[PDB]
Chains A and B, each alone.
Chain A
């Protein structure tokens, strides 16, 4: 057998000795501090496990146990939330009337006049309005009572302590060997079939037996109280056959292969629930079933201990064309002997996933009563755009850490990796052009519109009334999705989303979904999206390809991943390291995602969101100003930023006045960053010397000598304040704007 369990017993003694010696993990820091730079190095190097030991087995043991610690903090986080929903919320009052009661799971103490933050939300309750969608998620599970939330909170605490115990057990008591970690084919079979497959099967089981029948009674108008205990849905088929009259057959049409009997709970109707404005739970139960069969079957594609199956190595090595040379040879050693190469894939995938997740939750809203909560819709969408943005660049950082540290030329003669490095001047110069081509056109469309309008010539602007730029490719695709129910998807009753066209869904007088028409003002913005992604890719790609050498520095790989420069000769060598490429690309991701959430917040408010009256008279939030006000920069500056600021700037004395303070606080922090980004270290260290003198004059000085922040560190400070202040100012602007319109 090749797949076995290898574990070392009693590997590391558990004592408080090392806790009292900061910097024990590295060879240079263990001597103790001499300057204040030591304190900074202590934190920057604490998780760099690769630079602490040379053994791959010891690095892998540290990573494994740290995953248990990360999960234990997530369980504690989840257990808190459920606890707040059970003791500091208005969940019951919300369940009885989820159109008038606003949501809240946080209560502040009254101590310095801050009680004003407890808003008058409803249901004889005062608290801070929360926009995480905990409530809607609980209704979809069929919660209905605070008691049930309490058990989740106790079970979250127990799981959290189980994780803490497992991470301690696997690092000190039962430390598993290197052979165990290097089992990719086994690991893939378990994550596909076990984690994802049995996860979707059991979840589907909860949805069919507990979540489906409770939701049917809530939707029909039954008060929570009259709904029976969830376990009573598991015992009496009489209760289950009244709602879905195919339980009288039981489980026999499943083993006879007559699955169309269950069309009561395995639907493919599409659209949304006219009552709640969320997806049909019956579609979601079918969704998890079809997934779980796919995941369990996919977890049999690899060979472990029995002959049958694929070896990952013979797959990749078979793929070689006459342009690619050796093709995929060597990518195994890479992806089974280096943790950096793994994160580079994984973070790029998980970050892309969170972006994908945010696009699908506003167009096909999966929870009930969430589509008309515009504060939740807006908050959840931007959040995943940010988390997606950070993880994507984080994949590119580890790709460049891999090229510097784990990459070897002898392991890769003439393969795809070796070949990319060989024409790296061609990838970068061609990308460079595509960037100069996309920016001059997409941003120059706005300038033209800014000058034409200012010169009194609107007849010559790129608009829906002048020179049109109609997005005909995306309009063509919308028609296909609209005509799809019946033809291309003959068993589908309605379209996947109403964005491609169809009818208007409304819950409580508010609009949940509407067709989203695309015109030339849409078209122009989509290129800005195109353009800012291509530039971000230009910086990160360049950092990975030139991580080891350049024409400028031939021995860049000997200097390391993150070095400040190679001196003021050879012209300027500042920011040549691949860490500095990651540093620059963080500012672009920021630039790119900011335009995305600006585009989403304004298009939804202009052309979807709003209320209605008799004869379907739709009144939008900003009244349809999107086709003729977003084609110029002045229109974006005056109608989006200036007009919609009125809430956050007039929030004083109200319950949303914390958003006005955090608004100013983040404008302050953002400006504070510019002191670190524009200046440099040797002006600050001379400044410290005059200060130290005033201390020496008075007979005292710290024995840990004060030293200015280093070149690399002064950049990482200025970037962290730039993001914090920038994202924060928008955070405060988005919530005080959307709480006032929801």
Chain B
């Protein structure tokens, strides 16, 4: 279910079949023209749409344009060369901008920023001042 497009030279490279490639799925109620992140234009097909891209940003940039410009909503996948797929956006079905009970704290310092140690204190260690 790929959208209507005449092709372009700004698509995927070897990295796709050798390193991870990304696909994005969305559902549209009607046929409308949208801008390609690597290409100028394309007509989306009513029903489910499937697009393959080369970067997570390119996929997420299309989502942003699909969101506040068309009122529609999508899923990102990471595809490996062997065939294993990963589910990325949204992580738990709920968007990262909205709090969801069940999420946890990652990478949080429990103090303000002026409270980091001097670099001379962590001398000859394999760390850094912001990892204490």
- Chain A residues in 8 Å Cβ range of B35: 409, 548
B10 and A554 form a contact (CB under 8 A): no
Q: How many angstroms between the C-alpha atoms of A423 and B10 in the bound complex?
A: 7
* A68-76, A410-418, A517-525, A716-724: which lies at the interface: A410-418
* B56-64, B85-93, B99-107, B118-126: which lies at the interface: B56-64
A421 and B39 form a contact (CB under 8 A): yes
CB-contacts of B51-110 with A (<8 A): 54-55, 57-58, 61-62, 64-65
Query: Does any Cβ of A come within 8 Å of B114's Cβ?
Result: no
A414 and B6 form a contact (CB under 8 A): yes
- Chain A residues in 8 Å Cβ range of B39: 421-422
A554 and B37 form a contact (CB under 8 A): yes
Q: Which residue of B lies closest to A418 (CB)?
A: B40
B9 and A414 form a contact (CB under 8 A): no
Q: How many angstroms between the C-alpha atoms of A418 and B62 in the bound complex?
A: 18
Q: How many angstroms between the C-alpha atoms of A424 and B8 in the bound complex?
A: 9
The winner among B6, B10, B32, B33 for most chain A CB atoms within 10 A is: B10
Query: Does any Cβ of A come within 8 Å of B29's Cβ?
Result: no
Q: How many angstroms between the C-alpha atoms of A548 and B40 in the bound complex?
A: 9
A264 to chain B minimum Cβ distance, whole angstroms, is 61
B63 to chain A minimum Cβ distance, whole angstroms, is 11
Q: How many chain-B residues does the 8 Å CB contact rule pick out?
A: 23
> How would residues 259 to 298 of chain A score, 1 for a CB under 8 Å from any chain B CB and 0 otherwise?
0000000000000000000000000000000000000000
- The answer to whether residues A551 and B10 also contact, given A409-B40, A412-B41 and a CB cut-off of 8 A, is yes
- Chain B residues in 8 Å Cβ range of A179: none
**Count: A-B pairs, CB below 8 Å:** 57
- Chain A residues in 8 Å Cβ range of B38: 549, 551, 554
A423 and B8 form a contact (CB under 8 A): yes
- The answer to whether residues A555 and B40 also contact, given A325-B6, A425-B10, A426-B9 and a CB cut-off of 8 A, is no
* Pick from A413, A421, A549: contact of B33, CB under 8 Å: A413
* Pick from B9, B32, B43, B64: contact of A555, CB under 8 Å: B64
A656 to chain B minimum Cβ distance, whole angstroms, is 57
> How would residues 418 to 445 of chain A score, 1 for a CB under 8 Å from any chain B CB and 0 otherwise?
1101111110000000000000000000
- Chain A residues in 8 Å Cβ range of B64: 555
B53 to chain A minimum Cβ distance, whole angstroms, is 9
B8 and A422 form a contact (CB under 8 A): yes
- Chain A residues in 8 Å Cβ range of B26: none
A426 to chain B minimum Cβ distance, whole angstroms, is 5
A425 and B9 form a contact (CB under 8 A): yes
* Pick from A410, A414, A549: contact of B37, CB under 8 Å: A549
CB-contacts of B11-64 with A (<8 A): 32-35, 37-41, 43, 54-55, 57-58, 61-62, 64
A424 and B10 form a contact (CB under 8 A): yes
B2 to chain A minimum Cβ distance, whole angstroms, is 16
> How would residues 536 to 549 of chain A score, 1 for a CB under 8 Å from any chain B CB and 0 otherwise?
00000000000011
A554 and B40 form a contact (CB under 8 A): no
- Chain A residues in 8 Å Cβ range of B58: 551, 554
* Pick from B9, B33, B41: contact of A424, CB under 8 Å: B9
A542 to chain B minimum Cβ distance, whole angstroms, is 14
A409 and B37 form a contact (CB under 8 A): no
B70 to chain A minimum Cβ distance, whole angstroms, is 11
B33 and A410 form a contact (CB under 8 A): yes
- Chain B residues in 8 Å Cβ range of A423: 8-9
- Chain A residues in 8 Å Cβ range of B62: 554
The winner among A325, A412, A414 for most chain B CB atoms within 10 A is: A414
Q: How many angstroms between the C-alpha atoms of A585 and B34 in the bound complex?
A: 32
B99 to chain A minimum Cβ distance, whole angstroms, is 26
B123 to chain A minimum Cβ distance, whole angstroms, is 27
- Chain B residues in 8 Å Cβ range of A422: 6-10, 39-40
- Chain A residues in 8 Å Cβ range of B61: 549, 554-555
Q: How many angstroms between the C-alpha atoms of A419 and B61 in the bound complex?
A: 21
A192 to chain B minimum Cβ distance, whole angstroms, is 34
B41 and A554 form a contact (CB under 8 A): no
Q: How many angstroms between the C-alpha atoms of A554 and B62 in the bound complex?
A: 9
Q: Which residue of B lies closest to A411 (CB)?
A: B33
- Chain B residues in 8 Å Cβ range of A418: 40-41
Q: How many angstroms between the C-alpha atoms of A555 and B38 in the bound complex?
A: 10
Q: How many angstroms between the C-alpha atoms of A718 and B61 in the bound complex?
A: 34
CB-contacts of A541-571 with B (<8 A): 548-549, 551, 554-555
Q: How many angstroms between the C-alpha atoms of A421 and B40 in the bound complex?
A: 6
A413 and B34 form a contact (CB under 8 A): no
- Chain B residues in 8 Å Cβ range of A409: 33-35, 40-41
Q: Which residue of A lies closest to B62 (CB)?
A: A554
- Extra inter-chain contacts (7) besides given A409-B33, A413-B41, A423-B9, CB under 8 Å: A410-B32, A424-B9, A549-B37, A554-B38, A554-B57, A554-B58, A555-B37
Interface residues of B (CB under 8 A from A): 6-10, 32-35, 37-41, 43, 54-55, 57-58, 61-62, 64-65
Q: List 22 A-B contacts (CB under 8 A).
A: A325-B6, A409-B34, A409-B35, A409-B40, A410-B41, A413-B43, A418-B41, A419-B40, A421-B8, A421-B40, A422-B7, A422-B10, A422-B39, A425-B9, A548-B35, A549-B37, A551-B10, A551-B58, A554-B38, A554-B57, A554-B58, A555-B37
Closest 7 CB pairs of A and B: A422-B8, A421-B40, A554-B61, A554-B37, A409-B41, A409-B35, A410-B33
